[PDB]
Amino acid sequence: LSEQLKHCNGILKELLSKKHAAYAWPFYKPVDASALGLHDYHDIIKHPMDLSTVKRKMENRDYRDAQEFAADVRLMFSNCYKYNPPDHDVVAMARKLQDVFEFRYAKMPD
Ligand SMILES: COc1cc(C(=O)NC2CCN(C)CC2)ccc1Nc1ncc2c(n1)N(C1CCCC1)CC(F)(F)C(=O)N2C
Numbered sequence: 414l415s416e417q418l419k420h421c422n423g424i425l426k427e428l429l430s431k432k433h434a435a436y437a438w439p440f441y442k443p444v445d446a447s448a449l450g451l452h453d454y455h456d457i458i459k460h461p462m463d464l465s466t467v468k469r470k471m472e473n474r475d476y477r478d479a480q481e482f483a484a485d486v487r488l489m490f491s492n493c494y495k496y497n498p499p500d501h502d503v504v505a506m507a508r509k510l511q512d513v514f515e516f517r518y519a520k521m522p523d
């Protein structure tokens with residue numbers, strides 16, 4: 414990994430760590446819309462994204478730069494803001510995890 418992608422990998426590891434598990438856990442795995450009863454999920458959300466997919470793409474060297482990584486993480490949050498009422502608990506959890514992400518992403522070496 415490049416220096417910037419090392420920083421992204423560190424962010425990823427942090428977002429998956431026990432320190433943030435109380436609000437990060439809905440984002441660990443792909444939304445299983447059928448299991449959750451969300452039968453309109455894939456009509457509303459065109460591009461699903463989750464942290465296990467980000468992790469697989471990092472491991473496979475899919476991301477060519479930090480911007481591509483950031484776009485996927487932010488896409489995950491945007492899907493949550495699109496599908497759920499703004500006052501829902503899961504949106505509150507998204508906001509808190511995105512705060513962790515954005516403040517550490519801003520510390521990118523450059
Ligand atoms: C097994 O996992 C869960 C279990 C329970 C669970 O067990 N809920 C209760 C069931 C009955 N008892 C056990 C109390 C908890 C609830 C949610 C789960 N998982 C999940 N992952 C991701 C999302 C999500 N949920 N969101 C929630 C909001 C409300 C309806 C799903 C909707 C969403 F659109 F998919 C979304 O954006 N995200 C980010």
Ligand SMILES: [Cl-]
Nearest residue numbers: 480483484487
């Ligand atoms: Cl972006």
